[PDB]
Ligand SMILES: [Cl-]
């Protein structure tokens with residue numbers, strides 16, 4: 001389970017310079 | 027609030043705290 | 057909800073050079 | 083325990099771990 | 113309680129250059 | 139996946155995410 | 169205290185400034 | 190969404206790439 | 211951009227708010 | 232193991248040193 | 253090693269996978 | 274102070290303990 005700041009830390013890790021979107025209401 | 031010096035994942039942590047349930051876009055230059 | 061190290065990370069973010077106190081028994 | 087090189091939020095994380103329920107004061111120079 | 117990435121952050125803090133092992137199945 | 143620039147505790151966070159329940163060894167040079 | 173306001177309940181970043189020095 | 194796939198349920202780092210730009 | 215500005219210089223939480231959804 | 236000692240239960244930073252190399 | 257390579261230069265998640273148990 | 278010492282040089286967990294309440 002990846003939640004909260006831990007989920008966005010993981011997005012940063014996998015996406016890096018590509019950037020990403022965090023849209024929890026989605 | 028104070029100004030910030032934020033690199034790497036620290037910026038993403040800050041965005042998470044500022045935006046909360048609204049979410050955010052992380053868009054670096056490439 | 058901001059708990060534990062996540063709460064102190066947020067205090068650091070909002071307070072910065074002003075410094076802050078984390079007193080959970082309070 | 084080993085010595086530490088801690089800047090920014092990393093110091094606050096370390097203080098949190100060392101002090102636990104006792105809490106702590108974060109007091110940088112200005 | 114130290115769990116997940118918080119547990120490995122604490123191992124890093126106490127062990128540093130000695131290195132460490134995180135073996136949750138153990 | 140993208141390449142990574144990871145120092146300090148940031149490397150340990152990355153190892154945790156990559157390995158999950160498998161765990162990992164953190165072995166710096168001394 | 170801060171744990172009750174911000175962890176047990178929820179608080180804003182403005183409320184978090186109550187705990188700055 | 191991502192919260193349901195990755196926080197409520199579990200996801201792989203490959204699934205996490207679905208949310209890159 | 212904001213990623214670069216916060217790291218090479220400084221940025222405010224109010225500037226970061228511009229990137230919320 | 233470490234998860235039982237430190238996450239399920241509680242451990243000290245001294246106990247955490249058991250897992251250094 | 254991998255600790256030094258990721259910090260002085262760059263490293264991939266696939267190289268990091270080599271250190272899983 | 275301790276904030277500056279840990280970042281420009283090094284500091285020990287025992288020095289950090291001085292800032293607990
Ligand atoms: Cl964290």
Ligand SMILES: [Co+2]
Pocket residue numbers: 036092148
């Ligand atoms: Co850092």
Ligand SMILES: [Co+2]
Pocket residue numbers: 006062118
């Ligand atoms: Co957490």
Ligand SMILES: [Gd]
Pocket residue numbers: 009035151
């Ligand atoms: Gd982190």
Ligand SMILES: [Gd]
Pocket residue numbers: 039065091
């Ligand atoms: Gd953090």
Ligand SMILES: [Gd]
Pocket residue numbers: 095121147
């Ligand atoms: Gd961290």
